[PDB]
Chain A
């Protein structure tokens, strides 16, 4: 419900740097993984849930 449309938010999220220092060598490329959608061997899950209830 923000003033920014979905692709705007998604693009900004894509640009957030994430610490990768030791995990990245372990992870497989998602295109190479045998999982069907996303598994801990090829991805990291994030969630965000924020609502403004104040003035």
Chain B
């Protein structure tokens, strides 16, 4: 349930800062690593999208008038970073809401059924929701085709 960021390093003990913002001491063995959400989504008071590595201001919450850089994000929590803050090694945590702004067709064999390339046959190398890349069996070229002009050839 609780995920934190290690803010201080010592010989024996650890001082890991959890989401709630308090400081709890743990050992090396007990604490196990967790991967970082390189991509995620959240919500804010302004109702605007917020991603990591964005400068934000804590206009409300545990801290007031505080500026930091996001390093990790949680469903309802986010970890801010700084260099001017003595307390907690410059890293604190505040709520996300309180923060404010400051493929199935790939590899199949298709027949182009409409348009100037009608009749040609190829293998789909890449398909978005609307358009596909088809390597043509006969021309040494890969072309982009609207997916509405394709029919998969069945065995």
A residues lining the B interface (CB < 8 Å): 7, 30-31, 36-38
Complex-state Cα separation, A36 to B118, whole angstroms = 9
- Considering only CB atoms and an 8 Å cut-off, how many residues of chain B contact the other chain? 8
Complex-state Cα separation, A54 to B116, whole angstroms = 44
Shortest distance from the beta carbon of B139 to any chain A beta carbon, whole Å: 11
| Neighbouring B residues of A30 by C-beta, 8 Å | 118-119
Interface of chain A, helix or strand or loop or mixed? loop
| Neighbouring B residues of A31 by C-beta, 8 Å | 115-116, 118
| Neighbouring B residues of A7 by C-beta, 8 Å | 138
Q: How does the 8 Å CB contact mask read for B121-155 relative to A, with 1 for contact and 0 for none?
A: 00000000000000000100000000000010000
Q: Contact at A38–B119, with CB atoms within 8 Å?
A: yes
Question: Which of B111, B115, B116, B138 touches A37 (beta carbons < 8 Å)?
Answer: B111
| Neighbouring B residues of A38 by C-beta, 8 Å | 119
B residues lining the A interface (CB < 8 Å): 111, 113, 115-116, 118-119, 138, 151
Shortest distance from the beta carbon of A34 to any chain B beta carbon, whole Å: 9
Q: Contact at B151–A36, with CB atoms within 8 Å?
A: yes
List 12 A-B residue pairs with CB atoms under 8 Å apart, sorted by A's residue number. A7-B138, A30-B118, A30-B119, A31-B115, A31-B116, A31-B118, A36-B113, A36-B151, A37-B111, A37-B113, A37-B119, A38-B119
Shortest distance from the beta carbon of B116 to any chain A beta carbon, whole Å: 6
Shortest distance from the beta carbon of A43 to any chain B beta carbon, whole Å: 9
Complex-state Cα separation, A37 to B111, whole angstroms = 8
